[PDB]
Design a protein around this ligand. Sequence first.
Ligand SMILES: Nc1ncnc2c1ncn2[C@@H]1O[C@H](COP(=O)(O)OP(=O)(O)NP(=O)(O)O)[C@@H](O)[C@H]1O
Ligand SMILES: Nc1ncnc2c1ncn2[C@@H]1O[C@H](COP(=O)(O)OP(=O)(O)NP(=O)(O)O)[C@@H](O)[C@H]1O
Ligand SMILES: [Mg+2]
Ligand SMILES: [Mg+2]
Lengths: 307, 254, 279, 292, 65
Amino acid sequence: KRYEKLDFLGEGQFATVYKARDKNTNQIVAIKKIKLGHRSEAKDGINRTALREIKLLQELSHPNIIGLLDAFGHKSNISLVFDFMETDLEVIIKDNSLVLTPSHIKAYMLMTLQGLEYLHQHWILHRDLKPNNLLLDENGVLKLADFGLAKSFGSPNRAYTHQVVTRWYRAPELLFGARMYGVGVDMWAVGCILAELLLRVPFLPGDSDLDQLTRIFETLGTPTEEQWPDMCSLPDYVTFKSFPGIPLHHIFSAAGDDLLDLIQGLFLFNPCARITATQALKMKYFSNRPGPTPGCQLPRPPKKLIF
Amino acid sequence: PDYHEDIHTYLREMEVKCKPKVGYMKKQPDITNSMRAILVDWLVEVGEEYKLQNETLHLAVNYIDRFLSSMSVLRGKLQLVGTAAMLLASKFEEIYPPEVAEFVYITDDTYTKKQVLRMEHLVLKVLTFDLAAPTVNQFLTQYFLHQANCKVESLAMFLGELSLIDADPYLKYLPSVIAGAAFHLALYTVTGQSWPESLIRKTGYTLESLKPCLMDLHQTYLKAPQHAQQSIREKYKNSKYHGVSLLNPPETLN
Amino acid sequence: MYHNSSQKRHWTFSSEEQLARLRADANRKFRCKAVANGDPVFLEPHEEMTLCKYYEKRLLEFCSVFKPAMPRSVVGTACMYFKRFYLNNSVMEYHPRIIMLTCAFLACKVDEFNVSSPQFVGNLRESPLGQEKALEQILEYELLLIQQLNFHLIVHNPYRPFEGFLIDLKTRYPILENPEILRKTADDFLNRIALTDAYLLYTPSQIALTAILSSASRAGITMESYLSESLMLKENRTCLSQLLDIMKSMRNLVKKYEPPRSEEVAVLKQKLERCHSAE
Amino acid sequence: MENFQKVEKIGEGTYGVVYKARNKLTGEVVALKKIRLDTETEGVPSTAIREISLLKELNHPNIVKLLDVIHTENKLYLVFEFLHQDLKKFMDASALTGIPLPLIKSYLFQLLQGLAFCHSHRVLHRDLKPQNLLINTEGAIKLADFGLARAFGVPVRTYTHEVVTLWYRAPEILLGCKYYSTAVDIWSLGCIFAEMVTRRALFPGDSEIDQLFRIFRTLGTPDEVVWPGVTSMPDYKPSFPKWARQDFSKVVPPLDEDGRSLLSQMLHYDPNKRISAKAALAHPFFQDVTKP
Amino acid sequence: ALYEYQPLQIETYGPHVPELEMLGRLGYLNHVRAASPQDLAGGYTSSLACHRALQDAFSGLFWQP
Ligand SMILES: Nc1ncnc2c1ncn2[C@@H]1O[C@H](COP(=O)(O)OP(=O)(O)NP(=O)(O)O)[C@@H](O)[C@H]1O
Ligand SMILES: Nc1ncnc2c1ncn2[C@@H]1O[C@H](COP(=O)(O)OP(=O)(O)NP(=O)(O)O)[C@@H](O)[C@H]1O
Ligand SMILES: [Mg+2]
Ligand SMILES: [Mg+2]
């Protein structure tokens, strides 16, 4: 007598997501039921991704980060209760009915960057930033979600499993096999999400890691040792052809000068020199006219044979 | 491949078990052969629109023919049968099938998505999950290794697809026989050679055995411009298929 | 970070009186349940505390010789889990041995110390049949243990604050020529702190600073200037007074700790074994 | 569908849930894969459709038996023969001691027989990993998890998302090839054979580039002599490091000359030159195979 | 409505921690392990580790339950 399953939201390899009501305040919540997996993991205990999500979300509280309302579990199967999110950024990006005015893009970027700044102040990397991991509510508040890949950074000698985001939003340092990284991996994914918002299509849609690196170097130029001092030292580094790269304002013709500067800063090949969330929020682009859209005003998503 | 012979033999084993009941067409009280041809032409149009492989089209045609050999379907639901069979063939053959939304949008929403879903379930139940059926495309691919002329292969594919449109002469021939006849007809049309001896020793089909289906296919090729259904000819006029549908068919075939 | 952690908001208590109240409350609840089910077999709260101390020492020994070598954070997390669990529960309901094994398992999973289940159970000094039985028991008790922690799995240990304080001393305190000689003794003091209930009463930074200052006092070195000037506590004397008061309370807590007696542990273990078969 | 009594839940995967059940009317322990056809916006899943369709025609002693298929309005039940544990668990429990060589040879012989039956029936498994090979108590091993299986009567194109786990992935897939072939299954089976022999993965890579580099390190960087056409592969970069092939004695120590020769035939760079399943069945390695 | 940046104000209940970019200028980095070129390639600097250690050392030091 705690949760009344009223819908099926989605299905995935790690878990099944459905819709429920709290029966106390009749609140609408999204319950993620964690699967048992393969029989070979039946002696492993509770799923490690579920434990990671629980432990990380029980220590964070920001408006732009998904909240873990409850973590009740049957001893056979554990379930995680989140706020119900109406949609995500990917649906809005792929929806041609609605138009992404500059204020919409600025507001989405601002919510993402504020959530990321809160996340990075607590020494946590999201590591799975993509448009469908930026969920939206009926009030138009963007929240980072899917913390199964998230981990805490800052402490040295903590290299661990090689869990990385999908290659389209993977930073070049990760594509070269870097074990030790900082906020730059989230910053590159934020730049890729901004490029997707400006183009309505994936910026660098490679079909493999090598092709992803090829596209990155073809679009932004193969970096030298001036712009990336220790590029060759990464364990999975390979040499590439010296592509001149496309000038930024050709790719983004409608972008302004401040937006071009922000995009350049987010796509710097040097992870140390890449602009952080705090640096990006202090940029002139966000303080320029027009202002970001208020969350309430953000957009919400042949022949018959005659026989 | 050293298993290749086995595969061919295995194909010859299952083309018998996946053949539609001959003469099922007159046991249908509502639908006739002309509207079956119209349905196959519409399926060709759909395959062009969604850029599906020819194997998907052949599999869908086979599924439709097997379904109609055991169930009576009204003239209103024949197109739904075609859509569900095409969706099943896309699920079985394509890398990723189009969502059902596109399979109902192509029919200008004649049937809702739920109808497509239910008829797909019924087709699966009748076919008893026997969806890996040998087609003319597969046998033609098997035969093409004994050549290689791009135009010959394209025209053999064109004639094999033409064999799907008409059910009166072609339902009594197995996919292997039709593929052999089409390969001979393409070899005659382009390069002037005949049914290769290697193929006779491989498949056991001599010239006399192929002769009936061969003459039927020759007549079909001759009357292709006058045929009411022309989507295959428009499909093969593109430079992708090397423009062999607009070729000049032989007037005599010895 | 600790300052907005679940450990600070829910698992640091104002006094040892609250801890004693909670443990006696758990004992009373178990006694009421057992008598409602259907007298000298029940253990008093002090006997439960003695058994808890003995089994925490056993958990420390188990983690000390674990293969592969556990990071110290994992051992601290397991000990904190044991303390938190038996704060609100009775050892007469869940056996302390299996609960300590479950705490070690959960600490390994939470701290990203990737070890498989056969590895963990192979670290047991038991027959393979016993290893499988203990594995099944641990798997059964894992989610109950996660319940009794209120799903608060992140545990903040004093080791990183200790390292940060050492860095700050090496940088901004030239008076102390080399803080490195303060390490070992402070480490020893930290272990003594781990034996008491200070982890449930004070912050990790306070514990690490207390260890550092105790080690300095043992060596005849005083850093009143470090607290008054480097930490800028000369502007607010009240906070400095509370800080020294906290440190002196921690030192008294360490001094008053009494390790269990072997024969008393044997008698209490026999009583627990008898009681774990009478429910 | 009242004929089965659910005993327990074996496990749950991407789209279905597997129960261990008892046949009430006969007493046979079976596995029931329940796939809820409701909550599906596309119908019966393409993976389930392909799996059932291909598994109905694969009646082999070394392939999991699909006893029955139950189709219901909004769910689908698949009845499989029940096997107690898989190969992955078997070597996880046989660690520190090692699966015996006769058992290794028998298991490899049965796997190759099952794969030869699959390929002679124009079925491409594409998902050969130890977690997908189920053993029983009498010493049999059977191929399972035909979720990635495809029929290659026409060429099968490579798709990025549907692909085997990285450790058993062929280098042609890792260099961006366009069409699958029966060589990738042989590559995975050879990797599994080496893993059984050495109790660890042959190429435990973490990324695509890392997997390719481990392959290149163990077998030598490919030039056009060993793999004609490699330099024109879509993802082949000329500046790939030129590692040198190390002799197989330190790659698989316990294996003898026959086993090493067979394994090197299963690990040919060129998919065309890689040994086929039945040609592997006709190798001197299996002159003395007795199911133990 | 234009946007004006405001820094996050989270109370740490302890001594003020120096800014990340000023750690080298204040001599903190001389007592931490130097970042390897491999670490620097990925964006990991010893400054991050030093800042995290200092923040952990000063977190909650003045707090009483
Ligand atoms: N907080 C939420 N509120 C509502 N729906 C949610 C929420 N979180 C997830 N979902 C839904 O759950 C579905 C499952 O998707 P996801 O959680 O990404 O699984 P996945 O496919 O394994 N992940 P990925 O492989 O990274 O795309 C999504 O499609 C969402 O629609
Ligand atoms: N016939 C069988 N006998 C015993 N166990 C079985 C059988 N069939 C399936 N299983 C078990 O059922 C579990 C899940 O099956 P399945 O639905 O195929 O998941 P999977 O393919 O292993 N996982 P994924 O690829 O991640 O979706 C596995 O772990 C197998 O151990
Ligand atoms: Mg997601
Ligand atoms: Mg599977």
